[PDB]
Amino acid sequence: AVRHLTGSVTRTQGLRFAVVVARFNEIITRPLLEGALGTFKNYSVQDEDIDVVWVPGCFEIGAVATRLGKSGKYHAIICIGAVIRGDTTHYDAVANSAASGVLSAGLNSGVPCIFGVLTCEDMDQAINRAGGKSGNKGAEAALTAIEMASLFEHHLQ
């Protein structure tokens, strides 16, 4: 008898989404964006309700989403990126800052910001998580964004 409130992936009417995608590691972030857009199209999300914002890198994602989340024009924000670490720690700061920025944008704006940024060690892992054996992270991020927008607009208001 406990109320289980879940977001709906079919009630996409009236929901607008903003997708922030980093241009760095575009060989990974472009298939992720294509998967996210395909998921949006498969769930009756119109093109005029989707805005794709390009940023040079993941570090600039958190500032953009906070900018997009505080405008009220979108019900969910998708943060798409790819941070391949490798054998060094040069990109650990970038990945941590991207995660912190996405979390802050989700928490400081009230608009759910979806963390679709890949943080993998090798590039084969990123390829497998961008449309490989592990699925497409962008498609999962788009589905998560739809569910979170439905939850926030139809069940948590």
| Residues 103-122 contacting a copy of itself, CB under 8 A | 103-108, 110, 112-115, 118-121
Region 129-148 residues binding a copy of itself, contact defined as CB under 8 A: 129-136, 140, 143-144, 147-148
C-alpha to C-alpha distance for 129 and 107, rounded to whole angstroms: 26
13 lies in the site for a copy of itself, by CB under 8 A: no
Q: Is 54 in the site for a copy of itself (CB under 8 A)?
A: yes
Q: Is 27 helix (H, G, I), strand (E, B) or coil?
A: helix
Would you count residue 16 as binding a copy of itself (CB under 8 A)? Answer: no
Residue whose token pair is 């704006």 = 109
The helix or strand, by DSSP H or E, that contains position 37, with its residue range, turns out to be helix 26-42
Active site residue 154: no
Per CB under 8 A, contacts with a copy of itself among 31-50 are 31, 35, 37, 42-44, 47-48, 50
Size of interface with a copy of itself, in residues (CB under 8 A): 93
Cβ atoms of 27 and 61 closer than 8 Å: no
Contact set for a copy of itself, span 70-89 (CB under 8 A) = 71, 84-86, 88-89
C-beta neighbour count of 8 within 10 angstroms = 14
- List the catalytic residue out of 4, 75, 90, 155: 90
Q: How far is the CB of 146 from a copy of itself (least distance, A)?
A: 9
Q: Does 94 bind a copy of itself (CB under 8 A)?
A: yes
In terms of Cβ atoms closer than 10 Å to its own Cβ (0-12, 13-18, 19+), residue 156 is exposed
**Which of 15, 119 has the CB closer to a copy of itself?**
119
Closest separation in Å from C-beta 23 to a copy of itself:
9
Which residues have C-beta within 8 Å of that of residue 137, sequence separation ≥ 6? 32, 35, 116, 118, 129, 130
**Tokens at residue 44, please?**
């009756």
- Which residues are designated catalytic? 90
